[PDB]
Each structure stands twice: as structure tokens, then as C-alpha cells.
């Protein structure tokens with residue numbers, strides 16, 4: 001069975017591999033609704049029980065499609081865990097209490113759910129962090145008390161933005177944090193913040209273990225924000241694996257899964273083959289361990305750009 005890990009103090013047990021549903025909004029090329037449904041059904045059948053989306057992905061399309069996918073499961077509601085977000089929309093950012101209070105109703109309508117398990121502020125580095133602390137999080141606390149979400153959180157790229165918020169709200173205010181692109185073969189800096197997150201009692205969700213396509217055979221999309229030198233070294237690592245009969249995406253995901261202090265790693269998936277590969281990579285990690293010789297050679301290739309990121313937001 002696919003390993004499950006406790007998520008902070010929420011009592012939720014998430015599969016160590018999570019379903020990133022942003023491709024269901026066509027972020028990484030177009031995908032049919034029938035394929036999306038089959039992909040989620042296969043993910044659930046393989047033991048994945050955690051699904052993450054946002055009103056932003058595909059201008060609310062990802063949520064609509066995921067809502068159809070989850071209905072097609074025909075499963076008990078407590079057998080899967082749904083996370084979505086608020087504050088970032090196709091028409092821009094709005095972290096006001098009025099916006100996010102409307103947003104949860106809009107998301108529940110699209111998702112065809114009475115409640116989500118997790119609701120998080122999306123990309124807070126683009127907002128006023130003082131508004132997040134003093135207006136947005138209180139509004140989310142009222143949404144939680146209404147029952148429309150069970151737990152609340154915050155997401156963003158820069159690791160520093162979390163400390164600003166978590167230092168200023170009372171203990172136990174935030175249930176979960178989602179960080180992305182910082183626990184993968186080229187960037188492990190999320191491990192630097194895990195001691196702080198443990199100190200605040202927050203469950204940690206990692207996302208983008210392929211760093212949004214850097215750790216794939218096809219390579220990153222044209223819009224990927226990483227510098228050319230990050231892209232060149234990631235391509236060299238993928239070419240090394242291809243030359244030696246190795247799967248760069250399998251190894252990248254196995255790297256991200258190896259830290260047990262992270263409850264789940266969301267990986268964007270848009271096909272049943274990707275689900276079969278990614279669950280298989282997780283299962284094989286438990287029974288065969290890691291290919292240490294290839295990881296060491298991958299590390300040597302990525303070393304010059306290790307832990308380099310890119311600017312995001314307005315802080």
C-alpha cells in the first residue's frame with residue numbers, strides 16, 4: 001500500500017504522493033475531461049487520497065473538472081481529502097475578507113462539495129502580508145468555523161514569507177503550509193525551514209517535485225521562471241539519466257519523498273501513465289530504496305545551481 005503520513009495536528013493521513021490538479025486546468029497543455037476523470041480514478045484506485053486545486057488554475061476550470069472527477073469516484077467523502085485556495089484569480093489578486101468568503105462558496109459550487117478539507121491563501125508573497133495576518137486569516141478562521149473548510153493554510157514561493165505570518169498569529173491558528181519547488185533534486189531549502197514549521201506545529205505540504213517540468217525528459221515549458229543556468233543543469237541531469245537508461249522523473253520524485261517530515265508531495269498529473277509511474281516510484285522507494293549511484297551523479301551535475309531560486313511576488 002501507498003504510505004500515508006500524518007498532517008500536522010489536523011488528524012488527516014495523506015498519501016505521501018498527492019495529486020496536483022493544476023494540469024486539469026490545462027496549465028501543462030490541454031487534457032480532455034474524460035482523460036482527467038480516468039486519471040483521478042486511477043490515482044484514487046492506486047491509494048492517492050489527497051487532491052489539491054485552486055480557483056486560479058485554468059480560470060476556475062481545474063476546480064470544475066476536479067469536481068467532476070471526484071464525483072466519478074463514487075467513494076465515501078472521508079476517503080479523499082480536497083485542498084483548494086483563495087486570493088489568486090485569473091483576474092488578479094484579492095485577499096480581502098469579502099473576496100475569500102465569496103470564494104469558498106464559488107469553489108464549493110464548482111467542486112460539487114459541501115466542504116473542502118483544506119483552504120489556503122494562494123501565493124501570499126503577492127499580497128500585503130499585514131492584510132494576510134489581520135484580515136485574510138481571520139476571514140478564513142470564520143470560514144473554518146462555518147464548516148465550509150476543515151483546516152486553513154498559506155502558500156507561496158519564498159520561504160521567508162511563512163515566518164512573517166506564523167510569527168504574528170496565535171499558536172494553532174494555521175493548520176498547514178504548502179511550499180513548492182524547494183524540496184527537489186536541485187533545491188532542498190524547504191528542509192531548512194522544516195525545524196521552524198515543526199516549532200509552529202504546522203503540517204507541511206511539498207509541491208512540484210519535478211520543479212514544474214525541469215525534471216522530465218521533455219524538459220520545462222517555455223514559461224518556466226528559472227534562470228537559463230538552472231535549466232541547463234537540469235537538462236544535463238535529465239540527459240545523463242536518459243544516456244544510462246534511468247528515469248529522471250522517477251528519481252526526482254523519489255528524492256522528494258525521502259524526507260518523512262513532509263506529509264505529502266503534490267505532483268501535477270494529467271494521465272493514467274503518469275499516475276502509474278509516480279505511485280510506482282513511491283512504492284519502489286519503500287521496497288528497493290534509492291539508486292544512490294545515480295543520485296550522486298545527479299547531485300554532481302546540479303551542484304553549481306543547487307538551492308538557487310527566482311524572484312516572486314512584491315515583497
Ligand SMILES: NC(=O)c1ccc[n+]([C@@H]2O[C@H](COP(=O)([O-])OP(=O)(O)OC[C@H]3O[C@@H](n4cnc5c(N)ncnc54)[C@H](O)[C@@H]3O)[C@@H](O)[C@H]2O)c1
Nearest residue numbers: 020021022028155207208209210211212249266267268277
Ligand atoms: N503557490 C502554490 O500554492 C503552488 C504552486 C505550484 C504548484 N502547486 C501545487 O502543486 C502541484 C504540483 O506542482 P506542478 O504541477 O506545477 O509541477 P510538477 O513538479 O509536479 O510537474 C508537473 C509537470 O510534470 C509532469 N509529470 C508528472 N509526472 C510525470 C512523469 N512520471 N513523467 C514525466 N512527466 C511527469 C506533469 O505532467 C506536469 O507537466 C500543482 O498541480 C498544484 O497542485 C501549488
